[PDB]
Nucleic acid binder design. Sequence first.
DNA 1: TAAGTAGGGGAGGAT
DNA 2: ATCCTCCCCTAC
Length: 428
Amino acid sequence: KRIVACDDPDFLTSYFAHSRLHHLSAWKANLKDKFLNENIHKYTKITDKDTYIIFHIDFDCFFATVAYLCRSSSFSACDFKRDPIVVCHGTKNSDIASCNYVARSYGIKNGMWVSQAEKMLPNGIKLISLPYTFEQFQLKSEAFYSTLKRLNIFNLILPISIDEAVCVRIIPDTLNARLCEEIRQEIFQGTNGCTVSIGCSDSLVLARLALKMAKPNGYNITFKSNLSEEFWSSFKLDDLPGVGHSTLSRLESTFDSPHSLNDLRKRYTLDALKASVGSKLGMKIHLALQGQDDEESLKILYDPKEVLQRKSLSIDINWGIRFKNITQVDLFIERGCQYLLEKLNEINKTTSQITLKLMRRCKDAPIEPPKYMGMGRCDSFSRSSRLGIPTNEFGIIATEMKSLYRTLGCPPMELRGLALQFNKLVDV
DNA sequence: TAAGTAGGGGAGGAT
DNA sequence: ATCCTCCCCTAC
Ligand SMILES: Nc1ccn([C@H]2C[C@H](O)[C@@H](COP(=O)(O)OP(=O)(O)OP(=O)(O)O)O2)c(=O)n1
Ligand SMILES: [Mg+2]
Ligand SMILES: [Mg+2]
């Protein structure tokens, strides 16, 4: 109890031990790495020639399911099929990391604050809050990835996240369904009762949309040639990979509030799209509306080893930042460089470019924000330098980081987040 | 109270 | 035209 402050040497350790988002990133980094280690000697690239089917397999409301199966004895009255359940730390402006399908029938979403969520519940319905079980999430994930390997279905299994793989079958030329049913059952068994859904298709996009359509505990096939208006009609605009809130808001402002992908698909033209959301995103949406992948997403198939290679390394801290003087800032920066170099050295690399980035309180914003210890509303400031020679040297990197800070000139009492980045990584 | 980061991509200056 | 820096955005 009593939370470790930002001027304490053990701050990173304690914050990261508690941050589900730090865990997400770490798990992701390590899975990519395990993938490179496991395939150093295997041949990997898929070609133009190849014909393939994608199975996109993902646990259903992952943290909520896993935290329910391991729920402490206090919560035994609790029922997963009948009660709305969230995993979070607090009771007010605290992020819901995962909610079960009961909560989502009230409109509760991942990443909503608890206070916001409880407001959506009618009289007589209670939110149940479960705590994080970081260890168990990882055990379930290992069961998951080992099970997939053990069945002998895929030519490749690309880890995407702690609870999600893109698994590919190379076809040389109805089983697709028997395969989805089998995977689902073996994972439910391997995992002691966690549920996975599957989207299967002949492109990464449609596999992803199919995954959504299948979602609570099911599978869906849909190929490029199965596309109907019924299908497009069932998706919000942000159900496209690569579309999030700001693109959604741009799409709405451009094409008179389409409410589903079918509406969009009916009103859009390429150039209007390109002009709305950028030219590359525009093109990707266009291809997606025809069930087709853009060239960028396809790299993960043609050169897995290149995409999964780590090209940068960083810390990004945006909660609990409160400093009174520059000496504190420097010590924190040094400590952050000690943490990062230890990671640099673990992966046998050096850097030749570094960036410091900071969130500074907006001139308008209250000194204390509604989120307890939160960054509140901020401006970004950013500065990078190329290093003379690739190096892993503390003296060189910490000195330049502290110098990047004086150049941005954010008074310490105004700092509300800090990021330390090694931007280009040179193998030893 | 309450708990990031990798990597695409664009705008605009530099070349 | 093409590259580089400092953002912005999305994912999970
Ligand atoms: N804003 C977010 C989004 C996700 N996650 C964590 C919670 C999830 O359990 C996990 C997986 O991301 P998903 O999008 O897959 O979330 P779910 O698995 O909970 O939902 P779904 O059943 O829609 O896949 O990572 C998080 O902490 N914060
Ligand atoms: Mg999931
Ligand atoms: Mg996922």
